[PDB]
RNA sequence: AAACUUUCAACAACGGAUCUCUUGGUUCUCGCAUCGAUGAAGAACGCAGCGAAAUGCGAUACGUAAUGUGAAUUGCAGAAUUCCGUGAAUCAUCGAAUCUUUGAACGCACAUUGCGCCCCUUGGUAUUCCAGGGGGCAUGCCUGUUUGAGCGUCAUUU
RNA sequence: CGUGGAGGUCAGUGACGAAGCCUAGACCGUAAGGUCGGGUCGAACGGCCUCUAGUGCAGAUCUUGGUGGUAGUAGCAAAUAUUCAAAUGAGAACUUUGAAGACUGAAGUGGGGAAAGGUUCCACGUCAACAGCAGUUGGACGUGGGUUAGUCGAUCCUAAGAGAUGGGGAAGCUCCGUUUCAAAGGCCUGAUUUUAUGCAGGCCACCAUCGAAAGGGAAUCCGGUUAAGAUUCCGGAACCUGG
RNA sequence: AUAUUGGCGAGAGACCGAUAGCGAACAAGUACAGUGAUGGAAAGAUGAAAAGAACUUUGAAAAGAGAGUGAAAAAGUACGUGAAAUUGUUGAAAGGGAAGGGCAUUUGAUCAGACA
RNA sequence: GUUUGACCUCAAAUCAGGUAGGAGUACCCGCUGAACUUAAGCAUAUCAAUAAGCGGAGGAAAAGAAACCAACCGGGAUUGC
């Protein structure tokens, strides 16, 4: 799917954050808040060069 | 509140009847997969919100 | 330059296109059996002088020609004549190619009777293959 | 168990309506004995003994408003028929099938002509 | 002092229950509904929000009336009943 | 020499990798045209003999009627089925119905289960009072019906 | 050299045990790797010729998940304070009752309410998790009971304000404005000097609706009663409004 | 004749195989968060059949030990297989302010082939 | 005839019968309309007559039977490859 793994709203922290500057979901309350995404390296992010 | 609105105590109602666990039967049927009750809710935990 | 991504044809269903084709020319034949799947087209001769050595198949045939076949317009159009108002005849050996061709039609159609029994005969799908355009 | 609508069809409204408050009588009873035994199976047929009194009932009574208003341009609009909104608001058969006076003619002096190319 | 301390004085609405979509998204003093656009006559969606719409949608309610319309267009809308 | 630290090996822990599974997803192709003032989509609240969900339904409430099938449902209870049959069922089909409060939402309002008006009918020892039941009262526009307004124009001495 | 899938072939391997995993055992390759034995396991899998790709990790303050040393460590030291006996219980520093010592000291650690919460109230049963010790106890867990009004409030009124209609803008979603720019609706009399079965004569006038449980406002008190109700229930005695 | 990531009904793939594939294979747009617009998870596998361990015994009890069911409990609703990090027990060994590695041999343990 | 009417225009009725709204929106017909980006330097072009916003339909919509294309020995509605 052209959408898969981009069906989130994240945001990277900025540099100097003690943490890696991969993008992080927002909001709060739930699990998926602070997880990496959008990356080919990251848990549910999109693939490396999706097929077409 | 004690003086409040009929909207708001029935919703409050509603909650009371849904506030239970699981009756002991359901455990007994066959091919049953509902083992606890997920949607509990108690009053200092998680508020209704309205 | 453009998002050319959001608008790409690929053309997978070429075989299921032809498929669909091939059951409406099928179904359009049983539904108008006996008579064809085409109208008798006339030969023009194509505009430009790159193109002027050569005849085609035409819209339909001018008022002039139907006229001289012996047929009126609304007649041959219920017969399955393909007549057009704007052509016009300017080319005497286009002019007889034409007439000839709506009289071998005439010679070659049987018509049946609005009332009465119908004589039963086999459907011919192709009018323009029973009567082919040949170069002069 | 329960009552039948067949056996239920045969009666007058008289008899219908006695049998319904029969049925709810005996189902207040059973909404007694419920606050002492919980499993009470009658309380099922009871309710469905009532909601077939209660649909034979409403069968007759728009039977014969049907019946009464047969035969009328206007019916009541739970009368009519439903289909779909648009389908209601298109045109009729009447209406989609005519033609100009002009147009008759012409279909009637030249129509589509059955032939074949055989001979 | 502007968070901890100031996070004891919340203890009013802005919004209340919506009658149309039932959420907690009333305005009381705008008497708007910042989820549905009621009391507006049509239904509040945007482009940009397809998750809203997807949240929102037919589909994710009980359909009483629209689930029948295929069985009665397939049998073609007919009246009547069957003759055994 | 023990203890302790580390290494090696066996078994036991921790944890859920690997492998094998899959009523799911993703992509392609084919066919069809069917929402709503005859009240849609969506929302709230309810409904099961013993249910909080999912699923179904609306005070006829996991449903009624009709047709088909032909003996179940099952956790328990309870039907069985005159078995020589107008007959289970959380079955299939679905053409008759029911369809609370809402919602474009339509008597006026709505942070209220607030406030009216019209017609019919019934019960309270009732010409006056009260209550119950049934059916109604939105806006724009079209055609027609009826009742009207304005020296705007005109006629009106046998 | 190695990995997922595809065409062909070995009438290939396999419940007398496929794949995977562990292994102080064995062999072949310079190596990438390949092969064999033993254990565990329980249903699929491989050699060769080719086709194909989301095909090989030590790092990216990489992603997700899991786990150590730190470490039985820092700490559980604000709000003066606890003790004796009996009962219950398997178990009592923490539960119950009695006996003592203290504290809040009426601007309370008392008795009621508003917002908010929504059953937390009360009874019975009861301890797996929670109450950073404990627990027989609990605002915990399981099953139920409980909120009674003509006089208390809402409901009615208007305040700052909000906002339709008549109109006028705006492609339009909609905007202005709140009595204007409107034919915006009620009442009285009549045997209307009768033209014969057709309604005549008069009168007064300004704008929907929403907006306060602390403003305005009709009218109720005492005694008793419950496990939990109370100006509402019961007894007695009143009052208001409408007819 | 053309379009069609919405709706209804079908057929398929050299696609993915539970950190993959839609966010969702499961009561998933759920639980949860935010005043609100919105944000948004984790989570599949006993066995062919629940036959889900009767009975005895110790313990207040959770449970343990016998016994039993089942092909198997090296399947006990922590449930197919069950890796690594990290940990316990047992056995062997080394250790005077790190350990680990390379070449060579001693010592202890252990082991294959060739056996006419 | 200071009467009785014919018309015209404008009203009203819970008058008789109807119709519009809203949802969905993949594709379709209109309106409105950026910036990130990519470059240049007669102060710009590109992204783009796109995203977002608004209005209106169907099973397809739109277009459509020339005030056309041409300059030939002429073709002959629209649509799509
Ligand atoms: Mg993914
Ligand atoms: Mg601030
Ligand atoms: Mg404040
Ligand atoms: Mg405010
Ligand atoms: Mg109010
Ligand atoms: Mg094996
Ligand atoms: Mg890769
Ligand atoms: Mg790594
Ligand atoms: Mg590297
Ligand atoms: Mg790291
Ligand atoms: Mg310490
Ligand atoms: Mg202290
Ligand atoms: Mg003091
Ligand atoms: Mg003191
Ligand atoms: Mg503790
Ligand atoms: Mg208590
Ligand atoms: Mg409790
Ligand atoms: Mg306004
Ligand atoms: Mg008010
Ligand atoms: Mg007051
Ligand atoms: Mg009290
Ligand atoms: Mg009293
Ligand atoms: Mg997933
Ligand atoms: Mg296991
Ligand atoms: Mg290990
Ligand atoms: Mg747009
Ligand atoms: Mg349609
Ligand atoms: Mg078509
Ligand atoms: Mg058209
Ligand atoms: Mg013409
Ligand atoms: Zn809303």
Redesign the interface.
């Known amino acids: 799917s052209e959408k898969a793994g981009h069906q989130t709203s994240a945001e990277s922290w900025g540099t100097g954050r003690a943490v890696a500057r991969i993008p992080r979901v927002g909001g709060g309350g739930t699990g998926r808040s602070g997880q990496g995404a959008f990356g080919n390296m990251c848990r549910g992010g999109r693939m490396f060069a999706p097929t077409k | 509140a004690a003086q409040k609105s009929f909207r708001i105590k029935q919703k409050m109602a509603k909650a009371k009847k849904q506030n239970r666990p699981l009756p002991q039967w359901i455990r007994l049927r066959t091919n049953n997969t509902i083992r606890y009750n997920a949607k509990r809710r108690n009053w200092r935990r998680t508020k209704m919100n309205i | 330059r453009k998002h050319w991504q959001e608008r790409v044809k690929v053309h997978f269903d070429q075989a299921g296109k032809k498929v669909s084709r091939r059951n409406a020319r099928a179904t359009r034949a049983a539904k108008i059996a006996p008579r064809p799947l085409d109208l008798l087209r006339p030969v023009v001769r194509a505009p430009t002088v790159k193109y002027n050595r050569k005849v085609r198949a035409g819209r339909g045939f001018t008022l002039a020609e139907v006229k001289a076949a012996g047929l009126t317009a609304a007649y041959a159009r219920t017969i399955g004549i393909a007549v057009d108002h704007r052509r016009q005849n300017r080319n005497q050996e286009i002019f007889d190619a034409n007439v000839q061709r709506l009289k071998e039609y005439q010679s070659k159609i049987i018509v049946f009777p609005r009332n009465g029994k119908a004589p039963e005969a086999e459907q011919v799908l192709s009018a323009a293959a029973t009567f082919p355009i040949a170069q002069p | 168990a329960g009552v039948k609508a067949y056996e239920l069809r045969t009666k007058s409204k008289e008899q219908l309506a006695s049998q319904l408050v029969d049925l709810k009588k005996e189902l207040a009873e059973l909404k007694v004995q419920k606050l002492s035994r919980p499993s009470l199976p009658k309380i099922k047929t009871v309710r469905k003994s009532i909601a077939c009194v209660l649909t034979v009932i409403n069968e007759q009574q728009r039977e014969a408003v049907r019946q009464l208003y047969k035969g009328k341009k206007y019916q009541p609009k739970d009368l009519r028929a439903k289909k779909t909104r648009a389908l209601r608001r298109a045109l009729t058969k009447f209406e989609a099938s005519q033609v100009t006076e002009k147009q008759r003619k012409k279909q009637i002096a030249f129509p589509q002509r059955k032939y074949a190319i055989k001979a | 002092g502007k968070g901890t301390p100031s996070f004891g004085k919340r203890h009013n609405?802005s919004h209340?229950?919506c009658n149309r979509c039932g959420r907690?998204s009333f305005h009381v003093q705008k008497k708007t509904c910042s989820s549905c656009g009621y009391p507006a006559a049509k239904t509040r969606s945007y482009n940009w929000g397809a998750?809203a719409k997807r949240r929102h949608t037919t589909g994710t309610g009980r359909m009483r009336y629209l689930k029948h319309?295929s069985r009665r267009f397939k049998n073609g809308?007919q009246?009547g009943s069957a003759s055994k």
């Open positions: 609405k209340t229950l907690r998750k319309v809308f009246t």
